[PDB]
Every structure is written in structure tokens, then in C-alpha cells.
């Protein structure tokens, strides 16, 4: 009750955010939204390497927005997956990118392209 010391003990909507550019202000610098395309002629390398990138981002506590895929192109088929990423620190750009660089399994190329 309002006049009691135990007022507001049950409130919870301040514990939930029940609800894009790049933020480089003066010291706290970070990228905007990102996109990582994965193109391969194997379903397994694109899907499984997208899993490995996604588990790296969950293990680095990165706001991963979407992890969807793109339609293919009859050329054989070129397979694509898109992984969105927002939030990187200054060292974390180099340390984050160097493991995706040093973890490509077989003949799969990357993208750090951005939205739209």
C-alpha cells in the first residue's frame, strides 16, 4: 500500500524494456547495425558457420537482431545467410573481426556491409 514502507515491492515494468545510426559521440564509440552475408555452395557450411558466428556473438554478449537467410541464385545455387550485429567497442572491432577472419572453414566469403 502507498503509505507503507513496502510500497512498490511488486512493480516490474521498470525491469522490462517492453517497446538505426552509428553512435560515435566523444569517447564511447560504436558501429551501427551490421550485416554479415555468407555465400557458399554448401548448405552445411553457410548454416553451420552462421551458427558458429552466432554462438560467438552470444558468447561475447552482442545484440544480435536477426539471423535470417537470403534466396539463392541458379548458377548450382549460391547460398546466403545474413547475421545482424549492433554494438562494438574500440578493441572489440579488431578482436571481434579477427576470429571471423581466422575461422572461415572452406571457401566461404564474408561481408561487413550495412543496412539497406
Amino acid at each position: 500500500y502507498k503509505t507503507k514502507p513496502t510500497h512498490g515491492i511488486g512493480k516490474y515494468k521498470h525491469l522490462i524494456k517492453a517497446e538505426v545510426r552509428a553512435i560515435n559521440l566523444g569517447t564511447d564509440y560504436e558501429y551501427g547495425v551490421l550485416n554479415i552475408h555468407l555465400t557458399a555452395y554448401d548448405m552445411t557450411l553457410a548454416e553451420s558457420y552462421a551458427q558458429y558466428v552466432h554462438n560467438l556473438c552470444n558468447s561475447l554478449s552482442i545484440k544480435v537482431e536477426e539471423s535470417y537467410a537470403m534466396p539463392t541464385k541458379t548458377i548450382l545455387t549460391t547460398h546466403e545467410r545474413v547475421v545482424q550485429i549492433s554494438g562494438l567497442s574500440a578493441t572489440f572491432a579488431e578482436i571481434f573481426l579477427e576470429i571471423i577472419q581466422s575461422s572461415l572453414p572452406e571457401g566461404v566469403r564474408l561481408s561487413v556491409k550495412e543496412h539497406t
Partner: peptide, 14 residues
């Protein structure tokens, strides 16, 4: 004294 083509990631050191 060559014509290498290198790439940097950031202004951060290592």
C-alpha cells in the same frame, strides 16, 4: 619497397 596491398581494421593497437 614493394607494392603490397594490406588492410587495417581499426586505430586500436595490439
Amino acid at each position: 619497397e614493394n607494392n603490397m596491398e594490406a588492410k587495417f581494421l581499426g586505430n586500436a593497437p595490439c
